[PDB]
Design a protein around this motif. Sequence first.
Motif, PDB file in Angstrom:
ATOM      1  N   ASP A 144     -45.628 -17.360  -7.104  1.00 45.96           N
ATOM      2  CA  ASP A 144     -45.248 -18.371  -8.098  1.00 45.96           C
ATOM      3  C   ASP A 144     -43.750 -18.599  -8.133  1.00 45.96           C
ATOM      4  N   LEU A 145     -42.965 -17.499  -8.101  1.00 46.30           N
ATOM      5  CA  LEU A 145     -41.531 -17.649  -8.164  1.00 46.30           C
ATOM      6  C   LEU A 145     -41.001 -18.442  -6.972  1.00 46.30           C
ATOM      7  N   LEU A 146     -41.402 -18.098  -5.746  1.00 43.77           N
ATOM      8  CA  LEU A 146     -40.925 -18.761  -4.560  1.00 43.77           C
ATOM      9  C   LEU A 146     -41.461 -20.179  -4.457  1.00 43.77           C
ATOM     10  N   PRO A 167     -31.575  -9.059 -18.610  1.00 41.23           N
ATOM     11  CA  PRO A 167     -32.776  -9.429 -19.299  1.00 41.23           C
ATOM     12  C   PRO A 167     -33.569 -10.511 -18.604  1.00 41.23           C
ATOM     13  N   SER A 168     -32.866 -11.288 -17.757  1.00 41.66           N
ATOM     14  CA  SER A 168     -33.561 -12.405 -17.105  1.00 41.66           C
ATOM     15  C   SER A 168     -33.077 -12.663 -15.689  1.00 41.66           C
ATOM     16  N   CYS A 169     -33.847 -13.399 -14.917  1.00 45.48           N
ATOM     17  CA  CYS A 169     -33.419 -13.819 -13.598  1.00 45.48           C
ATOM     18  C   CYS A 169     -32.194 -14.702 -13.767  1.00 45.48           C
ATOM     19  N   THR A 170     -32.153 -15.466 -14.864  1.00 50.56           N
ATOM     20  CA  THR A 170     -31.045 -16.371 -15.138  1.00 50.56           C
ATOM     21  C   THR A 170     -29.795 -15.620 -15.465  1.00 50.56           C
ATOM     22  N   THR A 171     -29.820 -14.334 -15.833  1.00 48.99           N
ATOM     23  CA  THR A 171     -28.573 -13.645 -16.174  1.00 48.99           C
ATOM     24  C   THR A 171     -27.605 -13.764 -15.010  1.00 48.99           C
ATOM     25  N   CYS A 172     -28.048 -13.715 -13.766  1.00 51.85           N
ATOM     26  CA  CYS A 172     -27.196 -13.865 -12.636  1.00 51.85           C
ATOM     27  C   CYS A 172     -27.393 -15.241 -11.989  1.00 51.85           C
ATOM     28  N   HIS A 173     -28.591 -15.798 -11.892  1.00 46.38           N
ATOM     29  CA  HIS A 173     -28.728 -17.038 -11.116  1.00 46.38           C
ATOM     30  C   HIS A 173     -28.529 -18.270 -11.961  1.00 46.38           C
ATOM     31  N   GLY A 174     -28.473 -18.158 -13.307  1.00 50.65           N
ATOM     32  CA  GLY A 174     -28.367 -19.316 -14.157  1.00 50.65           C
ATOM     33  C   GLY A 174     -29.739 -20.009 -14.300  1.00 50.65           C
ATOM     34  N   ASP A 201     -30.389 -21.996   4.144  1.00 48.56           N
ATOM     35  CA  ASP A 201     -31.196 -20.966   4.788  1.00 48.56           C
ATOM     36  C   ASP A 201     -32.013 -20.120   3.816  1.00 48.56           C
ATOM     37  N   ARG A 202     -32.114 -20.480   2.541  1.00 49.83           N
ATOM     38  CA  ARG A 202     -32.844 -19.681   1.584  1.00 49.83           C
ATOM     39  C   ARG A 202     -34.296 -19.470   2.021  1.00 49.83           C
ATOM     40  N   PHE A 203     -34.825 -18.267   1.768  1.00 52.17           N
ATOM     41  CA  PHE A 203     -36.224 -17.928   2.021  1.00 52.17           C
ATOM     42  C   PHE A 203     -36.642 -18.134   3.467  1.00 52.17           C
ATOM     43  N   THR A 204     -35.823 -17.792   4.440  1.00 54.41           N
ATOM     44  CA  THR A 204     -36.194 -17.958   5.844  1.00 54.41           C
ATOM     45  C   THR A 204     -36.112 -16.605   6.576  1.00 54.41           C
ATOM     46  N   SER A 255     -34.887  -4.490 -11.765  1.00 52.57           N
ATOM     47  CA  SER A 255     -33.859  -4.595 -12.758  1.00 52.57           C
ATOM     48  C   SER A 255     -34.268  -5.474 -13.957  1.00 52.57           C
ATOM     49  N   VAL A 256     -34.912  -6.607 -13.726  1.00 54.24           N
ATOM     50  CA  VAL A 256     -35.256  -7.472 -14.834  1.00 54.24           C
ATOM     51  C   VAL A 256     -36.523  -7.105 -15.605  1.00 54.24           C
ATOM     52  N   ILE A 257     -37.624  -6.950 -14.895  1.00 54.59           N
ATOM     53  CA  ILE A 257     -38.905  -6.680 -15.477  1.00 54.59           C
ATOM     54  C   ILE A 257     -39.148  -5.190 -15.638  1.00 54.59           C
ATOM     55  N   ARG A 297     -35.363 -10.067   3.951  1.00 52.91           N
ATOM     56  CA  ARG A 297     -34.357 -10.348   2.908  1.00 52.91           C
ATOM     57  C   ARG A 297     -34.959 -10.729   1.557  1.00 52.91           C
ATOM     58  N   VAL A 298     -36.041 -11.502   1.565  1.00 55.34           N
ATOM     59  CA  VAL A 298     -36.702 -11.856   0.321  1.00 55.34           C
ATOM     60  C   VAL A 298     -37.284 -10.602  -0.322  1.00 55.34           C
ATOM     61  N   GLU A 299     -37.922  -9.746   0.479  1.00 53.84           N
ATOM     62  CA  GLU A 299     -38.538  -8.532  -0.078  1.00 53.84           C
ATOM     63  C   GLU A 299     -37.507  -7.540  -0.596  1.00 53.84           C
ATOM     64  N   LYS A 300     -36.379  -7.460   0.125  1.00 54.49           N
ATOM     65  CA  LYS A 300     -35.290  -6.591  -0.336  1.00 54.49           C
ATOM     66  C   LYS A 300     -34.733  -7.002  -1.718  1.00 54.49           C
ATOM     67  N   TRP A 301     -34.440  -8.291  -1.881  1.00 56.54           N
ATOM     68  CA  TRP A 301     -33.891  -8.759  -3.181  1.00 56.54           C
ATOM     69  C   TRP A 301     -34.915  -8.829  -4.285  1.00 56.54           C
ATOM     70  N   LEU A 302     -36.181  -9.185  -3.907  1.00 56.33           N
ATOM     71  CA  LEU A 302     -37.243  -9.188  -4.911  1.00 56.33           C
ATOM     72  C   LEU A 302     -37.542  -7.789  -5.392  1.00 56.33           C
ATOM     73  N   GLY A 303     -37.513  -6.816  -4.475  1.00 55.51           N
ATOM     74  CA  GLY A 303     -37.733  -5.430  -4.874  1.00 55.51           C
ATOM     75  C   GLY A 303     -36.656  -4.992  -5.885  1.00 55.51           C
ATOM     76  N   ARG A 304     -35.390  -5.155  -5.575  1.00 56.32           N
ATOM     77  CA  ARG A 304     -34.332  -4.777  -6.473  1.00 56.32           C
ATOM     78  C   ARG A 304     -34.304  -5.565  -7.778  1.00 56.32           C
ATOM     79  N   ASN A 305     -34.361  -6.897  -7.691  1.00 59.47           N
ATOM     80  CA  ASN A 305     -34.229  -7.788  -8.825  1.00 59.47           C
ATOM     81  C   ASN A 305     -35.417  -7.805  -9.770  1.00 59.47           C
ATOM     82  N   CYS A 306     -36.649  -7.713  -9.289  1.00 59.67           N
ATOM     83  CA  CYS A 306     -37.785  -7.554 -10.195  1.00 59.67           C
ATOM     84  C   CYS A 306     -37.655  -6.225 -10.958  1.00 59.67           C
TER      85      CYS A 306
HETATM   86  C1  HEC Z   1     -27.920  -9.855 -10.713  1.00 57.13           C
HETATM   87  C2  HEC Z   1     -27.849  -8.509 -11.043  1.00 57.13           C
HETATM   88  C3  HEC Z   1     -29.272 -10.525 -10.288  1.00 57.13           C
HETATM   89  C4  HEC Z   1     -30.369 -10.755 -11.044  1.00 57.13           C
HETATM   90  C5  HEC Z   1     -30.666 -10.367 -12.491  1.00 57.13           C
HETATM   91  C6  HEC Z   1     -31.366 -11.377 -10.157  1.00 57.13           C
HETATM   92  N1  HEC Z   1     -30.826 -11.574  -8.911  1.00 57.13           N
HETATM   93 FE1  HEC Z   1     -31.637 -12.649  -7.347  1.00 57.13          FE
HETATM   94  N2  HEC Z   1     -30.132 -12.049  -6.211  1.00 57.13           N
HETATM   95  C7  HEC Z   1     -28.952 -11.443  -6.629  1.00 57.13           C
HETATM   96  C8  HEC Z   1     -28.058 -11.341  -5.519  1.00 57.13           C
HETATM   97  C9  HEC Z   1     -26.671 -10.707  -5.612  1.00 57.13           C
HETATM   98  C10 HEC Z   1     -28.713 -11.806  -4.439  1.00 57.13           C
HETATM   99  C11 HEC Z   1     -28.267 -11.799  -2.959  1.00 57.13           C
HETATM  100  C12 HEC Z   1     -27.100 -12.726  -2.619  1.00 57.13           C
HETATM  101  C13 HEC Z   1     -27.647 -14.011  -2.024  1.00 57.13           C
HETATM  102  O1  HEC Z   1     -26.946 -15.037  -2.032  1.00 57.13           O
HETATM  103  O2  HEC Z   1     -28.809 -14.046  -1.529  1.00 57.13           O
HETATM  104  C14 HEC Z   1     -30.005 -12.278  -4.839  1.00 57.13           C
HETATM  105  C15 HEC Z   1     -30.983 -12.789  -4.013  1.00 57.13           C
HETATM  106  C16 HEC Z   1     -32.249 -13.171  -4.428  1.00 57.13           C
HETATM  107  C17 HEC Z   1     -33.302 -13.625  -3.588  1.00 57.13           C
HETATM  108  C18 HEC Z   1     -33.181 -13.714  -2.032  1.00 57.13           C
HETATM  109  C19 HEC Z   1     -32.971 -15.139  -1.497  1.00 57.13           C
HETATM  110  C20 HEC Z   1     -33.001 -15.328  -0.019  1.00 57.13           C
HETATM  111  O3  HEC Z   1     -31.881 -15.590   0.498  1.00 57.13           O
HETATM  112  O4  HEC Z   1     -34.122 -15.227   0.511  1.00 57.13           O
HETATM  113  C21 HEC Z   1     -34.350 -13.945  -4.341  1.00 57.13           C
HETATM  114  C22 HEC Z   1     -35.750 -14.441  -3.895  1.00 57.13           C
HETATM  115  C23 HEC Z   1     -33.974 -13.700  -5.719  1.00 57.13           C
HETATM  116  N3  HEC Z   1     -32.675 -13.246  -5.744  1.00 57.13           N
HETATM  117  C24 HEC Z   1     -34.779 -13.934  -6.819  1.00 57.13           C
HETATM  118  C25 HEC Z   1     -34.536 -13.374  -8.051  1.00 57.13           C
HETATM  119  C26 HEC Z   1     -35.540 -13.266  -9.111  1.00 57.13           C
HETATM  120  C27 HEC Z   1     -36.970 -13.797  -8.955  1.00 57.13           C
HETATM  121  C28 HEC Z   1     -34.953 -12.585 -10.108  1.00 57.13           C
HETATM  122  C29 HEC Z   1     -35.591 -12.148 -11.464  1.00 57.13           C
HETATM  123  C30 HEC Z   1     -36.572 -11.174 -11.316  1.00 57.13           C
HETATM  124  C31 HEC Z   1     -33.576 -12.336  -9.731  1.00 57.13           C
HETATM  125  N4  HEC Z   1     -33.347 -12.786  -8.447  1.00 57.13           N
HETATM  126  C32 HEC Z   1     -32.646 -11.693 -10.500  1.00 57.13           C
HETATM  127  C33 HEC Z   1     -28.664 -11.079  -7.934  1.00 57.13           C
HETATM  128  C34 HEC Z   1     -29.543 -11.057  -8.988  1.00 57.13           C
END
Ligand code: HEC
Length: 112
Positions: free
Chosen positions: A104-106, A41-48, A73-76, A91-93, A80-89
């Motif tokens: 805004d997020l970054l 439901p939220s970005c915090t579900t995994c990142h806190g 090394d975050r965001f460098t 899943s959440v939104i 990698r940013v586009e890959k995780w943003l694509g998947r994570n946006c």
């Molecule tokens: C669990 C299912 C996740 C949720 C929900 C969100 N993120 Fe996450 N994110 C997850 C993992 C397993 C990883 C990769 C492991 C790592 O240590 O990087 C990430 C990574 C990102 C990143 C990339 C960071 C970088 O190194 O450049 C970003 C920018 C990011 N996550 C942001 C993000 C946002 C905005 C989310 C809500 C939409 C979000 N994540 C949810 C796991 C999960």
Amino acid sequence: GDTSPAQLIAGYEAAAGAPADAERGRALFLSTQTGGKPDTPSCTTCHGADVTRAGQTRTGKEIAPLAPSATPDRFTDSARVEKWLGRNCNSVIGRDCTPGEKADLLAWLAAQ
Ligand code: HEC
């Protein structure tokens, strides 16, 4: 890596047509969403709610802290940013994040 956090944010701001707003980035990251997958439901579900601490996957494995203050090394890597943003946006939104949301997020995350 191949980029800096400022270079990434400036490219998103140009695509969005507006400067990043970290307060909006913080509100979106902490928000509870309903359009995506039920288990994320939220970005915090995994990142806190405090991104200087470690997060956890849906199975309980440790996720390194999102804050650059804790994990330097975050965001460098632009891909990698586009890959995780694509998947994570998606899943959440339930959709890709727009370039304005990404800026805004970054901008918020890059200052932690
Ligand atoms: C669990 C299912 C996740 C949720 C929900 C969100 N993120 Fe996450 N994110 C997850 C993992 C397993 C990883 C990769 C492991 C790592 O240590 O990087 C990430 C990574 C990102 C990143 C990339 C960071 C970088 O190194 O450049 C970003 C920018 C990011 N996550 C942001 C993000 C946002 C905005 C989310 C809500 C939409 C979000 N994540 C949810 C796991 C999960």
